[PDB]
């Protein structure tokens, strides 16, 4: 049945986390479920409802924020912890029920000799309130002097690069991550599986 999970899970154009791609959707609904968890992934954790039974609650709408991160940094995708992605690149709210998926992507996203198509907002003035794409690549001022938007001693480009070689550790292969935020706004329900 007509649902869009393909172009976001088996996709080809996965963007950097600093500009993580929102995708609001309206799924496929029948008398049975909406997707399968996994046959070959790397990390998969769904809150509120156990990761084996996502279809247990119908949702009015969802946001499947897709991006790529390091291996171990999937750690700091989960709500409650405050890693480097959680504060500046991507926060999940401390009271959250949704899910996170992360599959290894060395075989696709790694260019021999060093891929650099993937960035992430390293510096940023303060923490993000949940889900605010800080797309602005404006120069960052860590001090008392604005720099007219030109890099200097304390004026730094805010995005930086992962740099995926193919020889990396198991915790450094780019895991393509897709995080499903299940919204709670009260309208007729769209996203779910069975009857």
């Amino acid at each position, epitope marked *: 049945n007509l649902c869009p999970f393909g172009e976001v899970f088996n996709a080809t154009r996965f963007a950097s986390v600093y500009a993580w791609n929102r995708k609001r959707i309206s799924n496929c609904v029948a008398d049975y479920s909406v997707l399968y968890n996994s046959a070959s992934f790397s990390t998969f954790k769904c809150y509120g409802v156990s990761p084996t039974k996502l279809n247990d609650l119908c949702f009015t709408n969802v946001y499947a924020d897709s991006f790529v991160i390091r291996g*171990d940094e999937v*750690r700091q995708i989960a709500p409650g912890q*405050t*890693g*480097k992605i*959680a*504060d*500046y690149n991507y926060k999940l709210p401390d009271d959250f029920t949704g899910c996170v998926i992360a599959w290894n992507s060395n075989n696709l996203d790694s260019k021999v000799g*060093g891929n650099y198509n993937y960035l992430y907002r*390293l*510096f*940023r*003035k*303060s*923490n993000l309130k949940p889900f605010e794409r800080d797309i602005s690549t404006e120069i*960052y*001022q*860590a*001090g*008392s002097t604005p720099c007219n938007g030109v890099e200097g*001693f*304390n004026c*730094y480009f805010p995005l*930086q*690069s*992962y*740099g*995926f*070689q193919p*020889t*990396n*550790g*198991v*915790g*450094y292969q780019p895991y393509r991550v897709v995080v499903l935020s299940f919204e709670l706004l009260h309208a007729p329900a769209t996203v779910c599986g069975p009857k």
Partner: antibody
Framework: EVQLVESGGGLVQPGGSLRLSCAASGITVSSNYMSWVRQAPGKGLEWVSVIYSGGSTFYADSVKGRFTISRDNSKNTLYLQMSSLRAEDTAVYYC???????????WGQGTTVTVSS | IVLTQSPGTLSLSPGETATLSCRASQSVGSSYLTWYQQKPGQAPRLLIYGASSRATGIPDRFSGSGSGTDFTLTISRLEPEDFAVYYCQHYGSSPTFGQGTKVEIKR
């Protein structure tokens, strides 16, 4: 014309509490990854803790929970508040400006902490 | 993650070349790892950010190299101010310094 003042050495019994002071010149500590590291006496160089631009601390796994890293944005200060200390933590502690991809670039003078019964 | 730093120690003469081979437990990328210089007692300053990107004030005589299993800091023409102990740290979750490599004058 830029540096991190370090002050407040320490001479303490184990299990006590203590404090050390970092103070930025030019740097706005409310806009940086600040981080304390420690040299044990003549042994390695262990990273201790990090405070993010926003309030968020990450401590070394051997000093987890027992320390605290705190902020005074109003008067531009970084605080090491040490609790429930231990014998080996005798060290020299460094306040260090941090740019993870550019590496910790600005480092304080470092101040000595002695923990012993 | 563990960052061994081969070899144990390196002795050198003024004006001479140098290589120092930091070696990860795993094999890792090159962007994150950095190379610091510590004088004896003073506070550790920075030498190399990224794989080999020399930082501000860093003389052209320092060069990073390598990737994966090992990275190497190198010096073309020596100078006593370059005589210190170098720590390679790979800023993974949080820095994991190598045990250092005292650089001392061949005598």
């Amino acid at each position: 014309e830029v540096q991190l003042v370090e002050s407040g050495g320490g001479l303490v019994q184990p299990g006590g509490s203590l404090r050390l002071s970092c103070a930025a010149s030019g740097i706005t500590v409310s806009s940086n990854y600040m981080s304390w590291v420690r040299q044990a006496p003549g042994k390695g160089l262990e990273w201790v803790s990090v405070i993010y631009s926003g309030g968020s601390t990450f401590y070394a796994d051997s000093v987890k929970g027992r320390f605290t890293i705190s902020r005074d944005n109003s008067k531009n200060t970084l605080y090491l508040q040490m609790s429930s200390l231990r014998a080996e933590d005798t060290a020299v502690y460094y306040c260090a400006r941090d740019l993870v991809v550019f590496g910790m670039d600005v480092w304080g003078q470092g101040t000595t902490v002695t923990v012993s019964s | 993650i563990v960052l061994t730093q081969s070899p144990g120690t390196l002795s050198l003469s003024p004006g001479e070349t140098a290589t120092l081979s930091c070696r990860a437990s795993q094999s890792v990328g090159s962007s994150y790892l950095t190379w610091y210089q510590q004088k004896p007692g003073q506070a550790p300053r920075l030498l190399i950010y990224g794989a080999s990107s020399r930082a501000t004030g860093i003389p052209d005589r320092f060069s990073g190299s390598g990737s994966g299993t090992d990275f190497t800091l190198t010096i073309s023409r020596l100078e006593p101010e370059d005589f210190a102990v170098y720590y390679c740290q790979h800023y993974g979750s949080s820095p994991t310094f190598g045990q250092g490599t005292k650089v001392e004058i061949k005598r």
